């Protein structure tokens, strides 16, 4: 039997590590082989949605739990997994790992990773100019102005694919409004046309106007921006913890041991708790409802998920969802540990990035309207009117 598996781990060392994880399975399972097809993140979203709709999805596929996957589950395209989870598997994952892969009270995925929002600081550049790490949004705007004045790009941001810049908006909205107001809006219990979301839009444009980003940032991908930051060409980078690898594990990086992870700053008058973050347990593997080899495919998905989780922890491409007592802490990068310590530990609450929590057209609307904010092609007030009108 040969199972197909799709994932998005395109960069090094993840691409090599995933291949190794698959090679090990294949050596230990002569009669159940896996073959993988690997597609860059943003093209993978297109690929997996089309495949699921056309009933040509692989046996096992990587996904984002929550809103992203909800249509696949509602269409009957995803194998329910409850009957395969009475074997002790649950106790091998961290508490609460399954919540986002549970729909209508039933489990449709095997979690493997958690996301968390991280402000990354180039300590070398901060020390060079004697800039303190900013802890408030006022301090952050002052730091942006200080770096800009020295000819140093304050933030490396690649906004072409829209979701990386959206992280900035969703965090600022979380600091302005708090987690409950974000959830209510995303769940349709509050209009998007609310002063906290408009204030967030203004603060995002305050970053642009202060010269936080390089002139051509709308033209750059995430990968191009992580290359900018790992070459030491920007003071700060903000986004997912998954980007950490580009800085401490990518062999091209010039900033290993120079990068610190901190929480996004507080905003004066904001209603959000300073420890709230954008993220949650949202990396999962799912099995296709139409797989010819359901039992083998779930066995393989259990194995893949644990190995991806351990890999994520070791190379800092993600925060593990599986317990990691088998892993030796001295082999883990200090930045990954720091993400756990500075962002995740003792956090009051969290919410996934809005394009994983929303689905389809609504997620796309938010990504495109945020991209207009960055481009100064919309006012904060019209942003919030249009969000309400286009979504609801
Ligand atoms: O829509 C956004 C998603 O696209 C985003 O997904 C993460 C993209 O980054 C992946 O990280 C990989 C780690 O290492 C490799 O070398 C790859 O090239 C990277 O793509 C994460 O695994 C995905 O979770 O999540 C947030 C969402 O807003």
XYZ file of C-alpha atoms and ligand atoms in Angstrom:
420
model
C 0.000 0.000 0.000
C 1.190 3.543 -0.697
C -0.319 6.454 1.218
C -0.001 10.021 -0.045
C 0.894 12.895 2.367
C 0.919 16.600 1.591
C 2.661 19.246 3.651
C 4.210 22.711 3.326
C 7.626 22.231 4.851
C 9.614 23.681 1.984
C 12.485 25.418 3.736
C 15.693 23.863 5.249
C 16.301 22.166 7.579
C 12.583 21.176 7.793
C 12.396 19.808 4.255
C 15.313 17.408 4.978
C 13.963 16.490 8.417
C 10.499 15.698 7.162
C 12.027 13.484 4.406
C 14.023 11.679 7.111
C 10.861 11.152 9.219
C 9.168 9.677 6.144
C 12.252 7.547 5.297
C 12.180 6.121 8.828
C 8.484 5.208 8.520
C 9.086 3.627 5.194
C 11.922 1.444 6.580
C 9.718 0.356 9.513
C 6.602 -0.297 7.392
C 7.548 -2.226 4.259
C 3.949 -2.766 3.312
C 2.605 0.680 4.064
C 4.772 3.232 2.206
C 4.268 7.020 2.334
C 4.984 9.393 -0.506
C 4.907 13.130 0.145
C 4.268 16.116 -2.095
C 5.534 19.432 -0.630
C 4.059 22.824 -1.636
C 5.015 26.338 -0.491
C 2.599 27.696 2.216
C 0.487 30.134 0.237
C 0.276 27.848 -2.881
C -0.546 24.945 -0.522
C -3.704 26.672 0.692
C -4.848 26.839 -2.916
C -3.819 23.250 -3.632
C -5.486 21.610 -0.592
C -8.812 23.560 -0.917
C -9.148 22.669 -4.578
C -8.194 19.024 -3.984
C -10.696 18.578 -1.154
C -13.472 20.118 -3.205
C -12.635 17.935 -6.250
C -12.394 14.785 -4.055
C -8.706 14.345 -5.035
C -7.194 15.030 -1.650
C -4.343 12.853 -0.331
C -4.671 10.221 2.339
C -3.075 12.613 4.876
C -2.779 16.353 4.664
C -1.438 19.161 6.794
C -3.989 21.799 7.658
C -4.857 24.644 9.966
C -7.450 23.678 12.550
C -10.504 25.861 13.249
C -12.052 27.927 10.589
C -9.736 26.933 7.815
C -10.741 23.286 8.016
C -14.391 23.797 9.035
C -15.685 23.663 5.424
C -13.831 20.380 4.698
C -15.389 18.819 7.863
C -18.870 20.200 7.129
C -18.669 18.819 3.562
C -17.968 15.276 4.821
C -14.500 15.249 3.373
C -12.586 14.480 6.596
C -12.446 11.157 8.472
C -13.806 11.337 12.023
C -11.083 10.174 14.419
C -12.844 9.512 17.775
C -12.828 5.701 17.254
C -9.055 5.791 16.744
C -8.428 7.833 19.864
C -9.308 5.268 22.555
C -5.778 3.842 22.503
C -4.066 6.329 24.869
C -3.053 8.744 22.085
C -4.644 11.735 23.780
C -2.457 11.428 26.859
C 0.579 11.867 24.666
C -0.427 15.399 23.702
C -0.528 18.528 25.792
C -3.831 19.428 27.517
C -6.428 21.095 25.283
C -4.628 20.029 22.073
C -7.820 18.739 20.393
C -10.151 21.621 20.924
C -9.578 23.215 17.533
C -9.903 19.953 15.578
C -13.229 19.179 17.272
C -16.398 20.119 15.419
C -19.946 19.336 16.460
C -18.409 17.482 19.417
C -16.398 15.071 17.278
C -12.637 14.998 16.502
C -11.470 15.362 12.891
C -7.692 15.812 13.179
C -4.438 14.883 14.938
C -2.858 18.086 16.295
C 0.919 18.544 15.924
C 1.748 22.241 16.606
C 0.823 25.490 18.324
C 1.335 28.995 17.115
C 2.153 32.139 19.144
C 2.847 35.770 18.116
C 6.483 36.856 18.700
C 8.222 40.213 18.381
C 11.799 39.266 17.412
C 14.568 41.715 18.405
C 18.064 41.875 16.843
C 19.972 42.474 20.099
C 23.105 43.436 18.177
C 21.372 46.264 16.381
C 19.539 47.389 19.564
C 22.892 47.495 21.439
C 24.664 49.260 18.568
C 22.291 52.243 18.885
C 21.566 51.825 22.650
C 17.847 51.321 21.971
C 15.904 49.596 24.740
C 13.467 46.740 23.803
C 10.070 48.451 23.567
C 7.446 47.406 26.043
C 4.762 49.949 25.078
C 3.445 51.031 21.710
C 4.747 54.573 22.367
C 8.204 53.130 22.908
C 7.812 51.047 19.753
C 7.030 54.091 17.600
C 10.005 55.901 19.185
C 12.255 52.940 18.348
C 11.040 52.797 14.804
C 11.915 56.535 14.498
C 15.322 55.953 16.070
C 16.226 53.124 13.728
C 14.880 54.944 10.670
C 17.078 57.951 11.614
C 20.135 55.685 11.640
C 19.254 54.259 8.226
C 18.337 50.903 9.793
C 15.062 49.217 8.502
C 12.960 48.995 11.708
C 10.828 45.967 10.641
C 11.424 43.278 8.030
C 7.893 42.626 6.614
C 6.853 40.869 3.428
C 3.230 41.854 2.739
C 2.709 40.382 -0.726
C 0.747 37.378 0.484
C -1.178 39.585 2.966
C -1.353 37.239 5.935
C 2.035 38.320 7.468
C 0.970 41.967 7.730
C -2.442 40.880 8.971
C -0.756 39.420 12.051
C 0.238 42.924 12.925
C -3.367 44.223 12.676
C -4.828 41.214 14.567
C -2.306 41.765 17.447
C -2.867 45.410 17.649
C -6.685 44.755 17.698
C -6.125 42.228 20.474
C -4.226 44.830 22.547
C -6.857 47.535 21.789
C -9.979 45.488 22.341
C -9.048 42.372 24.290
C -9.668 38.688 23.425
C -13.414 38.638 24.178
C -14.180 41.470 21.693
C -12.109 39.795 18.974
C -13.932 36.503 19.527
C -17.352 38.172 19.569
C -16.662 39.941 16.320
C -15.284 36.838 14.656
C -18.307 34.837 15.909
C -20.797 37.427 14.720
C -21.774 38.637 18.225
C -20.417 42.124 17.584
C -20.126 44.379 14.563
C -16.610 44.833 13.060
C -17.399 48.523 13.020
C -16.206 49.179 16.551
C -13.841 51.831 17.904
C -11.222 49.353 19.103
C -10.856 47.869 15.620
C -10.760 51.342 14.053
C -8.188 52.468 16.636
C -6.145 49.355 15.742
C -6.262 50.312 12.041
C -5.031 53.765 12.898
C -2.119 52.341 15.014
C -1.139 50.037 12.112
C -1.025 53.106 9.805
C 0.934 55.004 12.574
C 3.574 52.275 12.104
C 3.578 52.790 8.352
C 3.710 56.570 8.632
C 6.622 56.393 11.130
C 8.623 54.491 8.432
C 8.495 51.051 10.095
C 8.782 49.153 6.788
C 11.080 49.282 3.793
C 9.662 51.105 0.764
C 9.070 47.876 -1.243
C 7.560 45.762 1.555
C 4.236 45.177 -0.205
C 6.146 43.417 -2.957
C 7.986 40.942 -0.654
C 6.962 37.477 0.538
C 7.375 36.155 4.093
C 10.379 34.191 2.941
C 12.002 37.288 1.545
C 11.384 39.166 4.771
C 12.813 36.352 6.977
C 15.898 36.464 4.688
C 16.148 40.213 5.249
C 15.990 39.698 9.010
C 18.368 36.726 9.149
C 20.966 38.750 7.213
C 20.852 41.368 9.911
C 19.112 43.986 7.672
C 16.308 44.995 10.059
C 16.037 45.681 13.799
C 12.766 43.703 14.386
C 10.470 41.149 12.866
C 6.914 40.349 14.055
C 4.862 37.259 13.297
C 4.537 33.629 14.076
C 6.862 31.599 16.286
C 7.174 29.347 13.183
C 9.508 31.893 11.632
C 12.030 31.320 14.396
C 13.691 28.620 12.361
C 14.573 31.047 9.585
C 16.728 32.848 12.214
C 18.352 30.073 14.318
C 18.211 26.954 12.113
C 18.501 28.107 8.498
C 22.163 27.640 7.611
C 22.197 30.987 5.696
C 21.334 32.927 8.836
C 23.799 35.544 10.122
C 21.842 36.193 13.317
C 21.943 32.941 15.271
C 22.451 33.894 18.932
C 21.651 37.562 18.224
C 17.842 37.249 18.296
C 15.572 37.679 21.333
C 11.825 36.929 21.424
C 9.486 39.241 23.405
C 5.752 39.908 23.669
C 4.197 42.556 21.457
C 4.094 45.874 23.432
C 1.134 47.142 25.452
C -1.031 49.998 24.173
C -1.989 52.834 26.578
C -5.717 52.811 27.124
C -6.027 49.399 25.405
C -8.511 46.993 26.969
C -6.465 43.888 26.223
C -4.475 41.994 28.783
C -0.696 42.419 28.076
C -0.148 38.612 28.094
C -2.791 37.751 25.422
C -1.380 36.399 22.193
C -2.342 35.536 18.585
C -2.037 31.793 18.195
C -3.320 28.530 19.724
C -3.099 24.843 18.782
C -3.811 25.106 15.112
C -1.243 22.877 13.169
C -2.958 19.469 12.476
C -2.920 16.470 10.185
C -6.169 15.270 8.773
C -7.135 12.077 6.993
C -9.368 12.144 3.888
C -12.843 10.602 4.345
C -12.447 8.950 0.935
C -9.043 7.292 1.697
C -8.984 3.696 0.648
C -6.716 2.797 3.610
C -8.307 4.573 6.623
C -6.772 2.534 9.413
C -3.233 2.712 7.918
C -3.628 6.353 7.158
C -4.600 7.184 10.805
C -1.709 5.068 12.113
C 0.649 6.971 9.849
C -0.917 10.356 10.789
C -0.332 9.572 14.513
C 3.289 8.788 13.805
C 3.794 11.830 11.539
C 2.165 14.277 14.001
C 4.424 13.250 16.937
C 7.556 13.320 14.757
C 6.610 16.785 13.347
C 5.946 18.079 16.831
C 9.361 16.915 18.131
C 11.034 18.280 14.939
C 9.258 21.655 15.436
C 10.550 21.851 18.988
C 14.117 20.940 17.992
C 14.487 23.217 14.969
C 12.062 26.027 16.042
C 9.702 25.716 13.075
C 6.828 25.405 15.575
C 5.735 25.008 19.208
C 5.094 21.311 19.936
C 1.495 20.070 20.669
C 2.827 16.591 21.704
C 4.543 16.045 25.013
C 8.331 16.213 24.690
C 9.765 14.377 27.746
C 11.677 12.156 25.219
C 13.578 15.246 23.985
C 16.706 16.633 25.637
C 16.349 20.257 26.480
C 20.017 21.055 25.806
C 19.461 20.246 22.123
C 16.681 22.835 21.781
C 17.334 26.358 20.640
C 17.356 29.069 23.325
C 15.027 31.159 21.094
C 12.391 28.395 21.098
C 12.640 28.166 24.891
C 12.444 31.926 25.116
C 9.253 31.939 22.996
C 7.765 29.529 25.571
C 8.995 31.636 28.457
C 8.341 35.141 27.256
C 5.117 34.643 25.282
C 3.313 31.367 26.060
C 3.910 30.706 29.785
C 1.179 32.151 32.067
C -0.603 33.869 29.174
C -4.195 34.921 30.037
C -5.757 33.918 26.661
C -5.199 33.653 22.939
C -7.036 33.657 19.614
C -5.834 32.260 16.224
C -4.847 34.616 13.413
C -8.014 35.794 11.817
C -7.462 34.070 8.429
C -7.402 30.681 10.225
C -10.322 31.551 12.492
C -12.512 32.986 9.671
C -12.952 30.894 6.477
C -13.077 31.527 2.805
C -14.341 34.877 1.586
C -14.366 36.455 5.084
C -10.700 35.640 5.692
C -9.854 36.924 2.249
C -11.814 40.161 2.854
C -9.800 40.849 6.068
C -6.435 40.047 4.395
C -7.227 42.378 1.443
C -8.640 45.255 3.635
C -5.584 45.049 5.916
C -3.397 45.179 2.809
C -5.248 48.483 1.867
C -4.447 49.824 5.368
C -0.703 49.152 4.774
C -0.875 50.748 1.334
C -2.634 53.889 2.754
C -5.464 53.115 0.259
C -8.172 53.174 2.956
C -8.910 55.165 6.086
C -9.294 53.371 9.504
C -12.945 54.444 9.472
C -13.668 53.024 6.004
C -11.711 49.895 6.826
C -14.081 49.143 9.725
C -17.244 50.067 7.743
C -16.111 47.838 4.882
C -15.225 44.952 7.144
C -18.701 44.998 8.672
C -20.445 45.469 5.321
C -18.440 42.925 3.333
C -18.434 40.215 5.962
C -21.829 40.738 7.580
O -2.446 31.907 6.824
C -1.321 31.820 7.726
C -0.619 30.493 7.417
O -0.029 30.452 6.133
C 0.462 30.281 8.472
O 1.045 29.033 8.251
C 2.386 28.820 8.706
C 3.366 29.189 7.575
O 4.690 28.874 8.025
C 4.794 27.500 8.209
O 6.019 27.409 8.593
C 6.979 26.633 7.912
C 8.215 26.251 8.725
O 9.311 25.800 8.077
C 9.390 25.527 6.715
O 10.686 25.513 6.204
C 8.320 26.188 5.816
O 8.765 26.737 4.636
C 7.402 27.184 6.539
O 6.333 27.429 5.700
C 3.955 27.100 9.425
O 4.142 25.698 9.617
C 2.482 27.345 9.024
O 1.744 27.080 10.235
O -0.073 30.248 9.776
C -0.645 31.481 10.197
C -1.764 31.918 9.208
O -2.206 33.232 9.561
